């Protein structure tokens, strides 16, 4: 799910250093900047609240395939908080999955969940 | 060894072109970064952005770092190189995205990657 | 009469000559050395010019004439000489503007097509009359 | 410490530094070239508001749609910017202006429409999705007539039909080389046409109401020209 | 003592928002030198409006002070101040002149003094 | 020849800011600038390639001269070598004549022989 | 030393009113390079004119430069200096031709080279 995070950041980081120094943005620099903004608000973390392995990958693998797409950057947190919620109870198996074979379940599940968990989220 | 009867006229030729071209993009970023990207004139607009093809474009993708990136790796021939960095330079791949250049190898792997993005 | 003509992008002068002949909706038109002061609009057209012995015509589009007995002035949206004719300029006008009225709702419209092409046909043509 | 970052530091300043001094004396010169063009221009304003002014004024200004106050249910605004940035708050002055008029004058967006010169002024209307009628951008630095002769007639013949009712031009004022300040101005109608030098006896060779028809459209171009 | 938990979730959200507003205008700092106000984006505009307003409001007037200038100097609760500040945020006092916000507490000395200049 | 060399040189050196503008008048960003970009080209040389004394100065002076202000800047590093071998089979009393005496030849017949190179040299 | 408490007020206000004039034209010079002699104000036009009659009296003929140009060279006292400075300054003479102000030495010498100029 995430082997090109930190290249891609780096690359993000780079890019938003550059093209501050102009107005006229392309479409594939402006999708670039959008998913880099949203990265960065994911990895926002509080003190004291660690996480199982087993949510990180679900919520970056969200994040890497375009389901986050369209929460506006500031929604990020409150979105990841309701998604760890509607997974302690919808989905509990992909988690057991996760947690037993060390891998991916299959991509179908977590499309559906993913999907059936966006409808029920609701832009404060 | 970059001699012209060592390596080639035409690889020396292509050597040079692409160190003057680096070396112009390297005095504009610190214009750039305070003037915008606009004022400058449209031939340095150009030469830049083929410059930042250039730099995208000497990135390799190494079997070894396969930990690091997630790709099998790739080897490519001097040939392969020079007629690629050539072809960039007289500016055949213009309409590329930017982010399609590095850790690639081939041009050929350079476009598939670009017509994968959507291009 | 002097005779002087105006343009926002510069004035183009004439000296004094005798009399001056310009054609409007007016229909038969034609000024007095001395005549009362008037004003009539003109269409794309030439205003003939003629000193003692020697003549000059000079076209226009746009104009607007006032006279009084002592200056003649055209306010001219653009007027050019005699010998500023620039006739392949505005042969290829001539076509530039004979496509835009078969073409429908060009990339200039017809209300610049329809004068174009009236304007190309006199800077073609009614120039160059000495 | 950071040795070579103030250094690095140092040689960056002074080629920013080499940069704005030329891009400086460009300036210079330009605006001397505008202001030797502006010169060319006078006369023929000169003499077309002698023209206007001694047609219109007496018995014979009557009535006409560029002449007398239609009922206004619309206004239309032209704004002139420039197509490129450096210049200081020259944009920025006549947004804010701009803006304000019509947050006072108006509530709705069907009470009003601009039309904008300038590639700056696009971006700053439609960053607010106000409305926008047309546009022209990237014009000559010594602009000509030719070059806005289609746009202004265009505006004069959308005032004729009736898609506004008044309309309302803002652009800076070349004061002093110092010193550049907004304005606002009305064109049509041609409201508060001040008396001309002495009243003409010009015969009307056609009908006045021709006369009219055909003045009106070229002053309000003039009038854009100058601005 | 700056958690959460030792002062107030309201005290923390405040804190946090005027040291990242602070931060912002640091940053802007070397643009602003060169090419002044001219050239900022709409929000950067705002947050150096704010900004210059947050640090002049964090001044305050000293008792011991009062033999250099003669001002009585002012004495202000923890409450009073988290208030002012987070109406400053709020962007409830955006009309008024910065110098106003200089060497006074709990805000409504601010408005008076703004007053008193003639706003 | 050298003293005038010096001149142009440094003034394109001086001007060197409004290269990108050419907005100005001929003399400031037009002459001066196209002068010095020819003078940079000349003053190029390879590696292990000698240049007599005499072969010198004749170059530097059809550059001060103005005689190579009609080829193209990237012409003129090939306009040198065959102006070299032209000297070879043409301008040999001109070549004898610098070396025996020190000094300039009569610039009315160096003048048609660099004109008459002029004349057999194909543009790029 | 430049102060009036060693060289005196007179000499002191021909100094510093020659150094402003100088001051004055160097700072003219961008306008001077852009716009030409022209598009100057009378003012410009005549602190010009008297700068650089200014600058080329600075100027002297030194004994040692006989090898090089052969003539003789002079010693000029301080109050002479001070004197023709003044008089150049009061604009009395701003016909004289520019050339006539240069490595002449003293006053009398500028008036002298004018008058075989014609
Ligand atoms: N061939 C020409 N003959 C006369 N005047 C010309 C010619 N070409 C350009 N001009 C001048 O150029 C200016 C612009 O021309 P104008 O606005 O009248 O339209 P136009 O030349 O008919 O346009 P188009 O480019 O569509 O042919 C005017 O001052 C006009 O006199």
């Given at each position: 799910?995430?082997?090109?995070?930190?290249?891609?950041?780096?690359?993000?980081?780079?890019?938003?250093?550059?093209?501050?120094?102009?107005?006229?943005?392309?479409?594939?620099?402006?999708?670039?900047?959008?998913?880099?903004?949203?990265?960065?608000?994911?990895?926002?973390?509080?003190?004291?609240?660690?996480?199982?392995?087993?949510?990180?990958v679900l919520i970056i693998?969200?994040?890497?395939?375009?389901?986050?797409?369209?929460?506006?950057?500031?929604?990020?947190?409150?979105?990841?908080?309701?998604?760890?919620?509607?997974?302690?109870?919808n989905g509990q198996h992909?988690?057991?999955?996760?947690?037993?074979?060390?891998?991916?379940?299959?991509?179908?599940?977590?499309?559906?969940?993913?999907?059936?968990?966006?409808?029920?989220?609701?832009?404060? | 060894?970059?001699?012209?009867?060592?390596?080639?006229?035409?690889?020396?030729?292509?050597?040079?072109?692409?160190?003057?071209?680096?070396?112009?993009?390297?005095?504009?970023?610190?214009?750039?970064?305070?003037?915008?990207?606009?004022?400058?004139?449209?031939?340095?607009?150009?030469?830049?952005?083929?410059?930042?093809?250039?730099?995208?474009?000497?990135?390799?993708?190494?079997?070894?770092?396969?930990?690091?990136?997630?790709?099998?790796?790739?080897?490519?021939?001097?040939?392969?190189?020079?007629?690629?960095?050539?072809?960039?330079?007289?500016?055949?791949?213009?309409?590329?995205?930017?982010?399609?250049?590095?850790?690639?190898?081939?041009?050929?792997?350079?476009?598939?990657?670009?017509?994968?993005?959507?291009? | 009469?002097?005779?002087?003509?105006?343009?926002?992008?510069?004035?183009?002068?004439?000296?004094?000559?005798?009399?001056?002949?310009?054609?409007?909706?007016?229909?038969?038109?034609?000024?007095?050395?001395?005549?009362?002061?008037?004003?009539?609009?003109?269409?794309?057209?030439?205003?003939?010019?003629?000193?003692?012995?020697?003549?000059?015509?000079?076209?226009?589009?746009?104009?607007?004439?006032?006279?009084?007995?002592?200056?003649?002035?055209?306010?001219?949206?653009?007027?050019?000489?005699?010998?500023?004719?620039?006739?392949?300029?505005?042969?290829?006008?001539?076509?530039?503007?004979?496509?835009?009225?078969?073409?429908?709702?060009?990339?200039?419209?017809?209300?610049?097509?329809?004068?174009?092409?009236?304007?190309?046909?006199?800077?073609?043509?009614?120039?160059?009359?000495? | 410490?950071?040795?070579?970052?103030?250094?690095?530091?140092?040689?960056?300043?002074?080629?920013?530094?080499?940069?704005?001094?030329?891009?400086?004396?460009?300036?210079?010169?330009?605006?001397?070239?505008?202001?030797?063009?502006?010169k060319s221009f006078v006369?023929?304003?000169?003499?077309?508001?002698?023209?206007?002014?001694?047609?219109?004024?007496?018995?014979?200004?009557?009535?006409?749609?560029?002449?007398?106050?239609?009922?206004?249910?619309?206004?239309?605004?032209?704004?002139?910017?420039?197509?490129?940035?450096?210049?200081?708050?020259?944009?920025?002055?006549?947004?804010?202006?701009?803006?304000?008029?019509?947050?006072?004058?108006?509530?709705?967006?069907?009470?009003?429409?601009?039309?904008?010169?300038?590639?700056?002024?696009?971006?700053?209307?439609?960053?607010?999705?106000?409305?926008?009628?047309?546009?022209?951008?990237?014009?000559?630095?010594?602009?000509?007539?030719?070059?806005?002769?289609?746009?202004?007639?265009?505006?004069?013949?959308?005032?004729?039909?009736?898609?506004?009712?008044?309309?309302?031009?803002?652009?800076?004022?070349?004061?002093?080389?110092?010193?550049?300040?907004?304005?606002?101005?009305?064109?049509?109608?041609?409201?508060?046409?001040?008396?001309?030098?002495?009243?003409?006896?010009?015969?009307?060779?056609?009908?006045?109401?021709?006369?009219?028809?055909?003045?009106?459209?070229?002053?309000?171009?003039?009038?854009?020209?100058?601005?």
């Amino acid at each position: 799910v995430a082997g090109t995070l930190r290249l891609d950041l780096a690359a993000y980081r780079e890019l938003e250093a550059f093209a501050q120094f102009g107005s006229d943005l392309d479409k594939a620099t402006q999708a670039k900047l959008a998913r880099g903004a949203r990265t960065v608000e994911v990895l926002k973390q509080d003190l004291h609240q660690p996480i199982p392995v087993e949510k990180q990958v679900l919520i970056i693998y969200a994040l890497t395939r375009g389901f986050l797409d369209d929460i506006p950057v500031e929604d990020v947190r409150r979105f990841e908080k309701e998604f760890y919620l509607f997974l302690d109870q919808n989905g509990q198996h992909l988690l057991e999955h996760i947690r037993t074979t060390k891998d991916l379940p299959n991509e179908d599940d977590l499309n559906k969940a993913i999907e059936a968990f966006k409808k029920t989220f609701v832009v404060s | 060894a970059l001699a012209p009867e060592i390596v080639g006229e035409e690889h020396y030729q292509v050597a040079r072109k692409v160190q003057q071209t680096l070396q112009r993009y390297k005095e504009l970023q610190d214009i750039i970064a305070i003037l915008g990207m606009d004022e400058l004139s449209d031939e340095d607009k150009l030469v830049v952005h083929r410059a930042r093809r250039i730099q995208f474009f000497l990135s390799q993708n190494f079997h070894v770092a396969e930990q690091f990136t997630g790709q099998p790796g790739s080897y490519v021939p001097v040939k392969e190189t020079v007629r690629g960095f050539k072809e960039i330079l007289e500016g055949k791949y213009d309409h590329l995205p930017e982010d399609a250049f590095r850790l690639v190898g081939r041009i050929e792997e350079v476009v598939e990657k670009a017509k994968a993005m959507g291009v | 009469i002097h005779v002087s003509v105006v343009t926002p992008d510069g004035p183009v002068y004439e000296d004094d000559v005798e009399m001056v002949s310009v054609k409007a909706k007016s229909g038969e038109l034609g000024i007095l050395p001395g005549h009362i002061p008037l004003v009539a609009p003109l269409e794309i057209s030439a205003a003939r010019l003629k000193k003692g012995g020697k003549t000059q015509y000079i076209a226009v589009s746009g104009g607007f004439l006032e006279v009084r007995p002592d200056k003649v002035t055209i306010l001219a949206q653009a007027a050019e000489r005699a010998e500023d004719i620039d006739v392949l300029r505005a042969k290829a006008a001539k076509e530039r503007a004979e496509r835009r009225l078969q073409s429908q709702q060009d990339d200039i419209d017809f209300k610049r097509a329809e004068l174009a092409l009236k304007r190309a046909m006199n800077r073609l043509s009614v120039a160059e009359m000495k | 410490a950071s040795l070579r970052d103030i250094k690095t530091r140092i040689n960056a300043t002074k080629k920013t530094s080499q940069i704005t001094k030329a891009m400086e004396m460009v300036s210079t010169s330009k605006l001397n070239r505008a202001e030797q063009n502006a010169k060319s221009f006078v006369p023929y304003m000169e003499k077309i508001q002698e023209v206007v002014a001694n047609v219109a004024l007496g018995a014979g200004g009557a009535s006409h749609p560029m002449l007398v106050s239609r009922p206004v249910k619309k206004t239309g605004y032209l704004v002139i910017t420039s197509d490129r940035g450096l210049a200081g708050a020259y944009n920025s002055n006549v947004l804010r202006l701009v803006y304000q008029t019509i947050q006072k004058r108006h509530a709705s967006p069907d009470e009003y429409a601009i039309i904008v010169i300038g590639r700056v002024g696009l971006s700053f209307f439609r960053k607010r999705n106000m409305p926008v009628i047309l546009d022209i951008t990237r014009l000559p630095d010594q602009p000509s007539f030719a070059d806005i002769k289609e746009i202004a007639r265009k505006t004069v013949g959308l005032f004729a039909d009736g898609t506004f009712d008044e309309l309302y031009m803002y652009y800076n004022h070349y004061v002093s080389a110092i010193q550049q300040e907004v304005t606002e101005r009305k064109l049509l109608p041609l409201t508060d046409l001040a008396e001309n030098k002495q009243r003409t006896v010009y015969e009307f060779e056609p009908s006045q109401e021709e006369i009219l028809d055909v003045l009106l459209p070229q002053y309000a171009e003039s009038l854009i020209y100058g601005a």
